[model samples]
Target: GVAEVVETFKNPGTYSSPVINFKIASPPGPGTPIYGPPRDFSGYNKSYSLAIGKTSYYDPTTGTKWNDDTITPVSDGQDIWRGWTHTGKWSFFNGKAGDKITLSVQRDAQEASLKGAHPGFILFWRPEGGPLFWAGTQDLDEGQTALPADSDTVIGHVIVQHADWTLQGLPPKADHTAPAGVDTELYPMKPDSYTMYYVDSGYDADKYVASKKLIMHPTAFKGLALNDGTAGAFTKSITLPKTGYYMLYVANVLEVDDWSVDADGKLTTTGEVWEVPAKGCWVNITISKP
Candidate 1:
């Protein structure tokens, strides 16, 4: 019977792209142990508790890597771009008057290196203490290319204040003693062990099967929005009308390079930009209304 089942095989001819589908019956007796749900086991789940860092190598033109150290002004100034610039007084993305936003000059360098090539930036965004999300960007300055009319930028801000900590709608109530490190507990993860994962369609599933750990991939932010406000300092604040856990997410977009197989039978890369989806970078801001 096993031989008869094996004899029913057939090749569907050579094609550029082939779709394969098969169904397997669950095994009897002692079957393989499964952990958690299928989505979690498949590693296709989103994380609501991690924050991502901004990638410094992204270039908007001639999609290539730009060295962060080579840039003239590293901070937000007359000739530099920084995360704070999006919300700073003189930031181009700032919603105010007399603000000049310039395209990344290092991206210009990458485009020049490729000789008038057109490439886009790998856009990224994340909260002050959230995971980085990926979003895609388009090429701005190619030869004779006109900038998109809809292209516009905005800046944002995050405010924090020091107040007496309270739990369960009341001040420490005399019975509940605060922990030693309660003040610094907002920062959940350790800086050293923090790793990022960027998985696109080209990721190697076989490598993950061999090594019990999921492979880490690089991604970018695609869609990130900010609260509406002027660039400079102001007392305008958004009040919370309800009490609940609010999660703010920052999206990113990325471009990956070609894929290759390593000595360990793992797929490798040296390719162009690849867009990676949101890396689950969010902030859990809780508010209560009295």
Candidate 2:
């Protein structure tokens, strides 16, 4: 049953993408020994909580791996793309329209490398029932192409904060205390790990499997009238336009090689401008109503 549920979001056949679908059964209840409902921010003004997540690499049970992929260069049809961005991380919350919410991001500094690390963050509002199609700059033929004019699946709200080596400040970690709830199942490998459906494709084979610990899948944020103010800031505040589930997508700021699209809708690049960093950093993502 769950296996079939994972099959729902299968095959990015022509797109060269990861077939990731998070929706399976109804959202689980609290303490149900599974990925329960996301941390609630409906009471953000009274009590706020923080989520501890990583930009690229997530260290959990004792090994390091890409949060998804290092965002490599690829070619889809005639479009020669520069980078294939990994689906970063997602945290969900409940909010109301007119709720002036301010989301702040800072380095967690739990480890030496995590200090002064740059992070990318964004906000999205998901309507009740719909599929949110997601694509990165690399997926759009270098921004030369655009989503369908009437497309509900699109994203523009973004903030990629640079690292400040001079600053060594840290924020409060997640402890599931009042006002501040641990948004994600940090240790998804535990007994109550979050379940996910994945279909892996490569040169050799196409494999399908279910994982309870995979946190690298993309989230459903596609909808109409999403926020539009993402101008690269550490603290972003905006008034909620509609009431529903809001998500915070967090990731590291990896250097990217610029690609250009010709008027003929072809893609070209001068080659590698930079490589994926040897490591990624941790950041503290906080949501509040101020």
Candidate 3:
């Protein structure tokens, strides 16, 4: 629940690209276990996205690069493309790591009327926090052939700062009362577990299989723990904000922080980057979504 207040946006610029639809959900059935209301991302209308990604490899050493695919904007006939990415771990700093995969999705772009909302899996990470995924760079190099025009979905606003941590209309309060050797706390998840998902349709999602923990077939974001649908439940929810658009309801995130830390290492508790399974889940999830 702790992260630097600074945010740096990264993503290549695409020309003539239309945004993707992610806000516009029909109300859920009565007596559902949902709190507040289930989320539906059709499009609040005017809420859409546009961006194109193809496959290429990069060797950090000697500035080596590889490309065998073309980016023709909306030419691929798909919103997000994942068929061309490599998932095996390559070379990282000192140890073995997954291949570099660039992940980017539209942020929260919910416009009330004639407007759109492009929100994302709200979380935090440092701009210099190392390769976003595998060993990929967050921002593509200049003039790298981004997109054609008016292609598929466009990701607008990422949930850089969570509004839930506002205490007294301010950042979470800091406290120095944490126990010894417990300064750094990680996001809730299984130990040494990796949770992988895909950029393709209906990958991390499933039709209404009430109260089931579904196992996502291995694809992107590999090495994460796979929870069998026997204990994992995917919602039976899908909302199309407009014509030729679709979305599925995700999760309910509840932050657990009884303490806080000031920027100067002033507080006792830590909001340091998640260190259990290495790379952060929300970071991977955000990149995986686009």
Candidate 4:
């Protein structure tokens, strides 16, 4: 009788959930509001309206009304620069069932201050609207010693885990596996041109199999390349045959610059742009069932 109903069914109770931690709210931080020093105008030919706290926008040819206070622009003494933009909007909830998500950016020396000599921080995401997956901790040692100045406030952390499926319970799963038999191929040391897809389609259909020819064994998949040049930083690694659920897909590309100056004051940088968008790396997939 099936061993008396498996000895009276005494072994089927294990489901606990609640573990998603993202940081950036320590002291008075995470209340979110670091809007800019932005407004040098260099010589005029203007249009500037900026507000990032109560959310307002209006720069219709420079009439001024850039809310959020602390923006004193009107220096003709040559040597007035502006560069700092911060925006915030957050929502969370995609717990358990196989969680996995990771986004990280850090440099909160207290709150605010970051400029040249290598000052980069971009991690935007929403409904597949691209550009910016990760970028931070670059160069450092220009102007005011750079690195998120003021006292320092540059923290971006997002880590969610669950993706390491224990080789699908080995035992003969390709002779106990190893030799590149579980997918992990990525090559993009940054010259730009990267597109990776497969956000946990039910954990890649029980652990991938759409061509199944993986075997890049250097140790077996864990290569992430994006050696600066602007893509910021990136590297990859994967080999989990005993974890659970996983999903992480990030896209990148961003560069913006707008400058103005005329009327014989000299200095006009023009507007430069290059933006590729597609971002939605929603994470929260866990794995722990050997």
The best candidate in terms of lDDT: 2
Where model 1 places Cα greater than 4 Å from the true spot, the runs are 1-100, 104-111, 115-220, 224-254, 258-290
Better of 1 and 2 by lDDT: 2
Best by TM-score, which number?
Answer: 2
Residue-wise C-alpha lDDT for candidate 2, range 163-266, written one tens digit per residue:
10010111112321212222234312212111121111101011111111112212211111122332111555678765555554454422213333455645
Q: Which tens-of-lDDT digit does each residue in 1-290 have in candidate 3?
A: 11122222233322111222222221112322212212222122112221111011111111211221222332332221112111101111111123222222221232112111111222211111122111111222333233222211212122111111110111121231222322234311222111111112222222123333222111221222222342112111222111221221122111112233345533232232112221111111122211
Question: Where is the poorest 10-residue window by lDDT in model 1?
Answer: 1-10
Model 4: per-residue Cα lDDT over 80-124, one tens digit each: 111111221221222222223333221122212221111111221
How do the candidates rank by lDDT, highest first? 2, 3, 4, 1
Worst 10 residues of 4 by lDDT: 1-10
Model 2: residues with Cα > 4 Å off, grouped in runs: 1-42, 45-87, 111-116, 129-233, 255-278
lDDT of 1 by residue, 62-110 (tens): 1212122222343211211112111111100111112222221111211
Q: What TM-score, computed on C-alpha atoms, does each candidate reach?
A: 0.16, 0.36, 0.21, 0.16
Order the candidates by TM-score, highest first — what do you get? 2, 3, 4, 1
- As for TM-score, the candidate ahead, 2 or 4, is 2
Which clashing pairs does model 2 show?
A: 48-179, 49-180, 71-84
TM-score, model 4 to reference? 0.16
- What lDDT score belongs to each candidate, Candidate 1 first? 0.18, 0.31, 0.20, 0.19
lDDT of 2: 0.31
> Candidate 3: lDDT over CA atoms?
0.20
